[PDB]
Amino acid sequence: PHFLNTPDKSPGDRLAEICAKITDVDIDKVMINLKTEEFVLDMNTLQALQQLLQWVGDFVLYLLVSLPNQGSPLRPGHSFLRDGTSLGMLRELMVVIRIWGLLKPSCLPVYTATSDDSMSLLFRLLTKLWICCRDEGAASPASDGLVSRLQPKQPLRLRFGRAPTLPSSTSTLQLDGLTRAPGLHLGAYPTEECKACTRCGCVTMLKSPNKTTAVTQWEQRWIKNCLCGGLWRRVPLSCS
């Protein structure tokens, strides 16, 4: 909904939705195919770089490196990548952040090295599996070889926001009345918390003030319950 576009013949929502029906590869061509002007909304756009850009980049890169992990200790391995619609949303995100980088130089780097940007081949292989994952289609072997090898731009250690388990149906429960024994989305996951770190349902545990300037959309969005995040806890800042 960040489309604060000038009045046009149609709305930005339906236009970004129909952007899915686009060319095969080279998103640098898709951007000129649809539009490139009416996307800027603020000069102080430096909000998703330190928080979201690295996040979405790590997510898509893990989605890449997951392909050679077909023989994983799981029938679906780590994930499916059989929807395409979500991948279409990811493509909309990557093209709009390409426009952002064209406008605001605080774009999303490759996070390791050798940007020679580098998201081009990434988007290319995403679309290559897209034609294999749009609708009523099976997964391809050339894309396997294309994704198997890795460049000097492939980090690791992704968050994987999830909740700790509680499988005490009739089996086992290692707890008492007190003394929990120890064993994030907008980043802010250091080694030991040094802020409010408002605990939440599953993974958030985000800081209460967040030291924000204009990213108030997220904070004002997560004041109430969250997805598997109604369990807003007050876990103390027992840093160790």
Binding site: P190, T191, E192, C194, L237, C239, S240
Partner: protein, 266 residues
């Protein structure tokens, strides 16, 4: 060749430099765990720079530098590599060298810590003496000689640096009855028993007798006479007196514990 120790020290220093670099970059990869009053832990960062200042300690190696720059192409080592190519089994020589050095140091430490003996008691050769004396005479500035003017016992005299020569009568071992005489000596026709002194050299003779009665071992007279000769040679300076001034008494000489200090100090 103590330069090997210097090179090992340099290796340890550069490894410590690498470790300090890793540690400071790891500490920079973490913030204030729990301060609640002030992030003073950042000062430890500066302290980490001190460890990086230990890189200047590697610069100290420039003082230890220039350790080896000579010819001698590996000291008679190459036999099969630079020689007969078919002679591949060479490294057995180096293996034996390491084995021997390890055994030597092991047995040395073992004998050094085996001073805590556990044998209660024993219950249910003039040529050798002269040879032992000549072998002990092999140290510099320790010209000794014997003549045996009277008796089958050994009459040995020592003259190290001055006219403070000392005579010690031996019975093929455990040479007792010490007599030091500063500036005259062998009056009459042989060794004498005047034992005249300046109330200090007589004290030195008392100390020597105390050591002889103290350094007496149940057997192995070689180590006994070796310790005796070292204990006597330790008197080559007589110029320093720790634990007090240089004039605590007439003279300050008593190194019974491998170190000279002021006399009358037990």
């Amino acid at each position: 060749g103590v330069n090997l120790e210097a090179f090992s020290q340099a290796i340890s220093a550069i490894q410590a430099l690498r470790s300090s670099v890793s540690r400071v970059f790891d500490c920079l990869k973490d913030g204030m765990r729990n301060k609640e009053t002030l992030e003073g832990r950042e000062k430890a960062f500066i302290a980490n720079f001190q460890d990086n200042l230990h890189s200047v300690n590697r610069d100290l190696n420039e003082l230890e530098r220039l350790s080896n720059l000579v010819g001698k192409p590996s000291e008679n080592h190459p036999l099969h590599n630079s020689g007969l190519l078919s002679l591949d089994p060479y490294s057995q020589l180096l293996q034996a060298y390491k084995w021997s050095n390890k055994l030597q140091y092991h047995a040395g430490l073992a004998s050094g810590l085996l001073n805590q003996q556990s044998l209660k008691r024993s219950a249910n050769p003039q040529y050798v003496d002269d040879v032992i004396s000549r072998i002990d005479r092999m140290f510099p500035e320790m010209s000794i000689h014997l003549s045996r003017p009277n008796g089958t016992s050994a009459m040995l005299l020592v003259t190290l640096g001055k006219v403070l020569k000392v005579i010690v009568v031996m019975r093929s071992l455990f040479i007792d009855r010490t007599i030091v005489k500063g500036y005259n000596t062998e009056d009459g026709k042989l060794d004498i028993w005047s034992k005249s002194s300046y109330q200090v050299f007589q004290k030195v003779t008392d100390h020597a007798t105390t050591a002889l009665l103290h350094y007496q071992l149940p057997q192995m007279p070689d180590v006994v006479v070796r310790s005796f000769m070292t204990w006597l040679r330790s008197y080559i300076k007589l110029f320093q007196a720790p634990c007090q001034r240089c004039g605590k008494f007439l003279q300050d000489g008593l190194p019974p514990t491998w170190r000279d200090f002021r006399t009358l100090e037990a």
